[PDB]
Design a binder for this molecule. Structure first.
Ligand SMILES: CS(=O)(=O)c1cccc2cccnc12
Ligand SMILES: CS(=O)(=O)c1cccc2cccnc12
Lengths: 39, 156
């Protein structure tokens, strides 16, 4: 049995931690909604 | 039930203790999450009930109480923020410049950020605070790290 609990407002925060790269990848999406890498 | 707009944790008591299986967005009276989080099961909100209204396994999305409301899109140039809601941890905004998933059907934004599986359904926002998609459906690249699509539905 599932239930929801509020966790916060949806707002942009100035001076949030900036991280993560921006990879450009070739991908395939199957009928089950699963992504895979194409080579 | 709590109808207030905002980000919510999706919990289950079926397994050991109370486990967080995902996250979702409440907006305009509709709850938005990823299909792999709830599989479309009914949701409890206090004394109230949330029933699925629309869902699609291929897009990996589901909406409750009404049709999908989120229609903002990544502009393809600007940085965004993942409003990550990890299990047992406080909501935290993380800024990043999305990459790209290139498919035979067009290109989709992607966020290279690694969080526990129970963070799936956390919203990705633009500078105006608009939800441009949900985090949690992606791939594991050549070194073991996770890259998520910025998954957005369609507002009918
Ligand atoms: C209730 S519905 O027909 O809109 C629906 C759609 C897709 C997936 C679902 C999974 C469970 C329950 N219902 C689901
Ligand atoms: C391989 S996995 O799908 O369990 C997974 C791994 C790392 C990070 C994830 C973030 C969201 C959802 N799932 C994630």
């Amino acid at each position: 049995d599932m239930y929801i609990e509020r966790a916060g407002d949806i707002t942009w925060e100035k001076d949030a931690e900036v991280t993560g790269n921006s990879p450009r990848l070739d991908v395939a999406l199957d009928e089950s909604g699963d992504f895979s890498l194409v080579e | 039930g709590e109808t207030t707009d905002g980000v919510y944790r999706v919990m289950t008591r079926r397994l050991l203790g109370s486990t967080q299986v995902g996250v979702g967005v409440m907006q305009e009276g509709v709850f938005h999450t990823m299909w792999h989080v709830t599989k479309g099961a009914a949701l409890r909100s206090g004394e109230g009930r949330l029933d699925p209204y629309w869902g699609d396994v291929k897009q990996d999305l589901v909406s409750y109480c009404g049709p999908w409301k989120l229609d903002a899109a990544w502009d393809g140039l600007s940085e965004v923020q993942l409003l990550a809601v990890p299990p047992g941890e406080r909501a935290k905004n993380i800024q990043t410049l999305p990459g790209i998933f290139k498919t035979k059907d067009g290109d989709i934004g992607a966020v290279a950020l690694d969080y526990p599986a129970g963070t799936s359904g956390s919203p990705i926002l633009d500078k105006c605070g608009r939800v441009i998609g949900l985090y949690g459906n992606g791939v594991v690249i050549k070194n073991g790290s996770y890259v998520s699509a910025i998954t957005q539905g369609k507002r009918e």
